[PDB]
Amino acid sequence: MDVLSKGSLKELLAHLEKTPLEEAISYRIGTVPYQNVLISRNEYYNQLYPDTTSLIDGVSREGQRNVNGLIMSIISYVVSGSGHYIPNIGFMLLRRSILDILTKHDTGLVTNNLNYGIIARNLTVSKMNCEQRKRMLICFKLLAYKDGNQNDYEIYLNQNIPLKQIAPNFIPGDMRTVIHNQDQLAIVGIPAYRLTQSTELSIRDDNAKSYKLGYVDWYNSNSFLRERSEFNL
Amino acid sequence: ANRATSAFLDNPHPVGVNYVDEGSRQFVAVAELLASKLIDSSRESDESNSDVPFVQAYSKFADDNPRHLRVKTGGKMANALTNVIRSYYSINAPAIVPQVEIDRLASKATVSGDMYNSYAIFNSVPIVEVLSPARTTVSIVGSDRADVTMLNTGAGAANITFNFGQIAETVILKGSVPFQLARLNQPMPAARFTYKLRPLDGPFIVVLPVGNPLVISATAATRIQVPLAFNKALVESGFQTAMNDGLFDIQNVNYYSSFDEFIISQYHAQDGINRVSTCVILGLALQAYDQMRRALPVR
Amino acid sequence: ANRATSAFLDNPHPVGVNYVDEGSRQFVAVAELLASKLIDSSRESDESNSDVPFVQAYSKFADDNPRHLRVKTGGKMANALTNVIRSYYSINAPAIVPQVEIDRLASKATVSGDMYNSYAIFNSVPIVEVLSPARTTVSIVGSDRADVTMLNTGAGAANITFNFGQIAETVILKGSVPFQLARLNQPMPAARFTYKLRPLDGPFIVVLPVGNPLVISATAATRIQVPLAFNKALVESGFQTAMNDGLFDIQNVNYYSSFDEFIISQYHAQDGINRVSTCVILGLALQAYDQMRRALPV
Amino acid sequence: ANRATSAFLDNPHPVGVNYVDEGSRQFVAVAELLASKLIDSSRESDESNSDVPFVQAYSKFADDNPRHLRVKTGGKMANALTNVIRSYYSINAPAIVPQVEIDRLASKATVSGDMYNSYAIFNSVPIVEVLSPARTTVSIVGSDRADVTMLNTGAGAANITFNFGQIAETVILKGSVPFQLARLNQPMPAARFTYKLRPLDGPFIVVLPVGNPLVISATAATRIQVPLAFNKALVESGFQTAMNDGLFDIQNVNYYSSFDEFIISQYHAQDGINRVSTCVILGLALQAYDQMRRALPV
Amino acid sequence: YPDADGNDVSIIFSGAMSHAIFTYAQSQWNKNIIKLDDYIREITLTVPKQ
Amino acid sequence: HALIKEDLGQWPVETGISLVNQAGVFAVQLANKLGIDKPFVLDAGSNYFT
Amino acid sequence: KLVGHNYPVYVEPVVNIMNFISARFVADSSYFGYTNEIMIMPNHINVPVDD
């Protein structure tokens, strides 16, 4: 809910600096993705509603134990709000910040073999909105510039023309680009009053709607409950 | 040798492993409490010819005010409850309700999500196996009362083995004609109509004389820990309602006539102790479902 | 070819057409409401060690204070409730209660006589017909759980046609041994213990192999709209009380074991949707009769 | 002339002759009232997040305030109720509880010990005997719904005599096929599916055709005087808990599947009127046992 | 002594009926004491959507 | 000899008159005496000596 | 109207408090100075008493 509230690149990067990798990994066992299922939407239809499960839903799903699974878990947290179940990663790695994983070599993770096309297909980029895609491209650029793969990122953008139009205008390692960036990346914000307490047909739309409706209540009450446990640590 | 088994005990499908934490248990208990208020408010609204009692209860339940143009289906609380019910029934059903929505709906009322405060009694009789010799025919019929029809055509009397599951506490056997039943490697008593047995003692042997058939009627009682709010009458009604609405229409799942057959069958499978806890939570969820649908009707 | 049918589905007698308007429906609702308070007054009497809660409840129900001389009968409300129950069962039963008396009794408490607020699930299994070929024996027995015993003495396997009607929603079939069932003009699957079927799908064919008999247990669930105050436990008890008290002893009527069988039999008759509404009102009346008579035995 | 009888009607064991006086009847009624408040306080305490209603209810029941490090046994009342149930079942069970303890516990609440206020309907079918001639096979299965299967292998049609006793009020007979039934030495009617009979009318003759089996389904209703607080759902739950807990385990006693079968069997035995009175007191005691055990799981 | 929350629990010698009546009264009033944030949520449902 | 007594006052009752009516009337007076008739919260954390 | 009035779902707490006191008044009579039984006996009859 906090990560989805950020609406600027410099807010999003600041949040990733303070957030450990533990928050991007779920301890719930979940279900296997890419499964054709029938769900109940009784507000609209008497019959069951066909849908397919995906990693970028708001619900935690089982994840693979490879490096590909950990990168997919990070991106899913940014774009959907929840991570995936990857057990026994390691105490040292889980303490590191998300930005440290993406942009630093001291972590001990190797991401040179990652294929950006495969990761996008596994995350169902075709079903992602403009804000979600821009967030995903930010994570790709950070990973590419860490590995010296700047050319591969540009070539990958040439192949996918629609992704090129919405590519973020920031160069990692340059502070000027982050300062002057004017991107809008807020999936969840203070709702327009027109929003109602109604369900949505798709799994993704309903879960995103749930985050939107609960943002006002979370905004008012998160500070005190966080402080009630943070003090005397 | 022939083997006969109860139909409802065959191949229990795995149950869901999600929405069984402490927070999810609170959500089910809150839904049951708020559904009970909804069904009571509809009675008051009908009596007084006013929508004030129903609007107050529906707003608490659905976090939204009823509107004439829209359709009253229970709101987001109804959507989560129906989808969690499917998750409990089978492991093939997905988990599509986010944890943020579960936590939000559990804060509406303050209750303790303890599913082991009380106990309930279930009457499904488990006959795991009945073994008969070559020249005997054995037929098992029924779940609440199992009638076992046995006929011997061979020259000599036949010994027929009855195996009841180790879970059940008490089994009572009544025959159309007096018969002899005894434990394995124990002396045969005189023929009598009624036997009371504890299935944990061991397999039982029934002596069948040649001639007219003998029918044995079996009844069983098992105690399963349940929350205090558990109501078997409401749980059974919700189970049939969910089946008619198609909530349990999932691939590679087994279907049962009653919730009693479902809970007993899952208990008798391997990892049955783990499975029963999920079934009890599903029982409370079905109790909330039944009260919600009766309050808000769809023709 | 032999035909077998359920015993309780045969020849449903016509139900009464009186006392089914808005005014009479509120009379039954008031009787149910006031009879509930009559039973609850007994518990309140024990707590206070006084009979004044029961006197208050009886006076509202019977329009007269109870007397130690005579047996408590319930007064005009009890007489009106007994007579409308008779009229609901059969068309031949007279409609002797005046409208004005129903008018006055319905004004005692505020209720809406709407019998379509909620739904109830009735568990009677309708088997309209089982069609079997020659040299096969089919026996249908039971209403709540229908056991169909089939034996074929022929040379080869026989096909048995099952017709469950069009009203029931779900029918579950469980066999003693695994068997094969499929709809008309469909391939036959592997032998399986449990089948879930919808009666609207069509007739069902069961392969009956030669050898030991095969028994199929059937359970059904049907949803019928009922008022919110409906309680199946109390309705069933009232049905047995009315039968024992001789409220159904009329000429040319059929008798049933439970209200479950009674409501399903009239549903499956020709133009059966007319009878369902009347039978539902009778069920609520029997619910009031059960509570009123348990508090005031005669 | 072969004879077939219902299994549950065979050899009812004598019931206890203790704790049946007026003072003891008040103890059972008081325990039921206090246990009902105990189960209601526990439900209220869970929702209200305050344990004050339960603490008050437990103090009344157990005469001692609940403690955190001590087990919620139930006190002297729970121990007394458990032993009185043992005495009711058999005459061979000892009467441990003294009369002084019963009188002290009965003074905790004021409630009429009357056990003849109301009535309850019991659904066990009392088939005392079914007389059949040679070359015919008869089997009786079931108690709630009695299933009588008859097969005639003789040359001509046979007559089967049915005896339903004189205690049951009404019995409804349903057959898989239309059949003929008439009273003893009375003209036979035309075949029909359903018969409503009065068991006191006398033994009934059924004409059994040759060749095809005939299955007759029997349902019965009997009325027994019970206290107004009697609840059949709670009595049945208490009966099975009592059997599982093992307090019905005495030498030379018959065991039954339900309290319905237990009370009908005692009614049909010799001096059945006297036995039924003790059974009703046991039923109310079992009702309190179910409510107290569910509130306090020991 | 303090409880898990900040409330103070007093353990004193007092009569049984006075304890039962007083504490039950406390529970009934405490049911209607709610946080301001929950109160604000209740009002927003009643008021129009803007 | 020593003993502890709980004194809630004396409330005579009449046999002819209904007990529920008398109990309810006495209930109003008892609530006023204990100070629980109006919405209240207990403030007794300061009643201590160290 | 007084006789036939039904308790509202959201009843005021004072009503619940009074019903609690009224129930205690009837259930626990000894606390408030009345009982349901007395025994009158001559002095020469000796009976066990609470010592």
From TrEMBL, chain A:
One Pfam family named in its UniProt record: Seadorna_Vp10
Domain of life: Viruses
Protein's name according to its UniProt entry: VP10
Species this protein is from: Banna virus (BAV)
UniProtKB/TrEMBL annotation, chain B:
Highest taxon of the lineage: Viruses
Protein name: VP8
Pfam families: Seadorna_VP8
InterPro entries on file: Seadorna_VP8
Lineage per the UniProt record: Viruses, Riboviria, Orthornavirae, Duplornaviricota, Resentoviricetes
From TrEMBL, chain F:
Domain of life: Viruses
Protein name according to UniProt: Vp2
UniProtKB/TrEMBL annotation, chain G:
Source organism, top-level taxon: Viruses
Shown chain mapped onto the complete sequence: 755 to 805 of 955
Species of the source: Banna virus
Name of the protein described by the UniProt record: Vp2
